[model samples]
Target: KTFKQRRTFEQRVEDVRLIREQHPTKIPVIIERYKGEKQLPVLDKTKFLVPDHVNMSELIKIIRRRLQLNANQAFFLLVNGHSMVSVSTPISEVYESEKDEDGFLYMVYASQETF
Candidate 1:
């Protein structure tokens, strides 16, 4: 026999709010380009400050615009080496789990064709 604890709808909502409150409004992310790709002129600095609410898809769009990449080009963001994060994942969650001791989330951007 097993017992499962059930939470009320309001309690679930409150729990979500509490989790979001624990993350900072602004998060620091460090982006690294793959060695195989040509460096973009717009990437003068690899460090970026993003809002905690931004999703991975929005982040990718921002990076594309900043780098002036064409629509045909494909890119992927990877965290903790081989872990491929989904576009729907919240940036704050990544920051909380993958941020280094220096408090910067390390992400790698690479051409989809390469890997």
Candidate 2:
């Protein structure tokens, strides 16, 4: 089914998968489950991660069309805490190799000091 016709969350995810497979160059815009009730910073602003080298205009267009938003609003940059002062590694790799307390998938970051 087309994305527009998807009513359930599962259906939407399936459409997203289809979109990804058909357009590998496209990056999916996702609302983090944890932040569903939270508000975005503001229009043209965000506090989440946006991959570098992305085509913002095209991405906005796709996001607007796919999500049916009246306008392209809010963009964020999430600086992964661990990624900031890492031993100099790729963030994607870190995410792939990390896990959370519940044994669920997550990237863990911890503060450190040179004693």
Candidate 3:
């Protein structure tokens, strides 16, 4: 048998506050800004939320799968800086490469999702 522990938003917020407090200098400016601010950060759909424990490789696999491309026909990409136009790849087309590469090249896949 397995049990799951769930945390509420308030509990998570409090925990984050405690964590920020530990790094006083890093957090001082943000804390001060929030103190006098009446408006909260915007919350809406169509925004990308970072998933917990996500890494690079998994994200690439997901993107490939969405594009309906076979593993042998697709490769992972890491874009630095900014992304201009957004893209939507269909899930049915994506596939991940199963073979390992030689040591000459170092590969890191995107982990944009969590299981």
Against the unseen true structure, what C-alpha lDDT does each candidate score? Answer: 0.66, 0.34, 0.28
User: What would the C-alpha RMSD of candidate 3 be, to one decimal place?
Assistant: 18.6
Candidate 3 at residue 72, lDDT?
A: 54
Query: What ranges in model 1 sit over 4 Å off?
Result: 1-24, 39-42, 113-115
Worst lDDT run of 10 residues, candidate 3, spans 27-36
Per-residue lDDT tens digits for candidate 2, residues 1-115, read 2222334656555654675467544333332211332433212311124342344343334434443445444432222222323434443343335422221122211112110
Q: What TM-scores do the predictions have?
A: 0.68, 0.28, 0.27
How accurate locally is residue 93 in candidate 2, as Cα lDDT from 0 to 100?
45
Worst 10 residues of 1 by lDDT: 1-10
Q: Write the per-residue lDDT of candidate 1 for residues 32-76, one digit (tens) a residue.
A: 776566644336566577888988889889988887888787777
Candidate 2, poorest ten consecutive residues by summed lDDT: 106-115
Q: lDDT by residue for model 3 over 1-115, one digit each (tens)?
A: 1000244546545644664456422211100111222332211221122232334444445445544555455233422212212234221121112111110111122222110
Best by TM-score: 1
Q: List the residue pairs that clash in candidate 1.
A: none
TM-score winner between candidates 1 and 3:
1
Ranking by TM-score: 1, 2, 3
**Runs in model 3 lying further than 4 Å from the true structure:** 1-50, 81-115
